[PDB]
Design a binder for this molecule. Sequence first.
Ligand SMILES: CCCCCCCCCCCCC/C=C/[C@@H](O)[C@@H](N)CO
Length: 360
Amino acid sequence: AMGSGVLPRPCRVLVLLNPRGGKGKALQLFRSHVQPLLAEAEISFTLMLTERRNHARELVRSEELGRWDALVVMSGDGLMHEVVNGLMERPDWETAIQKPLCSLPAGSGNALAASLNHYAGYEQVTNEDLLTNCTLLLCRRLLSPMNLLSLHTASGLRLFSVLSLAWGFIADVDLESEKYRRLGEMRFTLGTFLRLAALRTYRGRLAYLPVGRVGSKTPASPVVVQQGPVDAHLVPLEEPVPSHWTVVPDEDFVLVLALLHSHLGSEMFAAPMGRCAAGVMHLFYVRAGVSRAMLLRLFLAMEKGRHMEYECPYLVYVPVVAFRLEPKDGKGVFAVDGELMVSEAVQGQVHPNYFWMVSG
Ligand SMILES: CCCCCCCCCCCCC/C=C/[C@@H](O)[C@@H](N)CO
């Protein structure tokens, strides 16, 4: 996987850092593991600290982007989510979203970083090693375009996702996990085991548009969007999905996962079938009926990306460009790039190669 662009040498970057990350050690880690590499690479930087809710989002929304060669985001997937949404909320979003971005991991919730490390051909590492590897990619300066997920909720909120949308088991493991950050990446194992022992299924309606079913025509009247891009594949949540979509017959699920990248976490190689093409994401779902033992084995095999070798009949994988998910029985709880989100229904479509990341 070759680069499709490069940062100039020398260059200067804005570092948005959350000082609470890495158990309050992010700034220390920047000084010890990032700064010295940046110096040898002739990367000049400015540190801006962002910890409060929508602060990084607001900062990026108002920034004079022409003074920077890239924005480096040092915290986790959540902060990247904010930065990308900030960029897309601007009136000049079509040029702003083209400013290269870089993810440097601090603490847990670094799926994006873990994905990029994997794509560069590094071993699956965590903590300091991951941070060093991701800094090395920044120092090598190569860029690659990345897909972007546009999401619509039943309340009419339109938002963007850089990594994932999860519902059911996976989202519940996030809720259970948060109270064990102290354990680092072990917290997902704990959360998973707990939820496995108390396994439940979720009622809902899933439809999607697989890649090979995309034609030359889109729906006559798609969803109305305040600011572009237009989600041409999507029709309003009040209308049925177009007839060329697949509507899953099964309405009972253990989980649904839309995933743009290889990794769900630094020790979770969820999508080993290869890097998504431009405008495509991974869709997984698990149908009710799997045993707790088989789910356990799928989870344990995920670390090495071997879970698909089981050929579990309850696990379905399809490459898609769009999906719709409607939980039955009131609102469902979703995780979007690791963050909680509750809604009666969500749908989304992938936009091809919309932003640029430093990567190997
Ligand atoms: C896809 C293969 C399915 C095999 C079954 C096993 C599933 C258990 C996986 C639980 C891990 C949940 C933690 C990650 C949550 C995500 O929202 C991240 N974006 C947060 O960092």
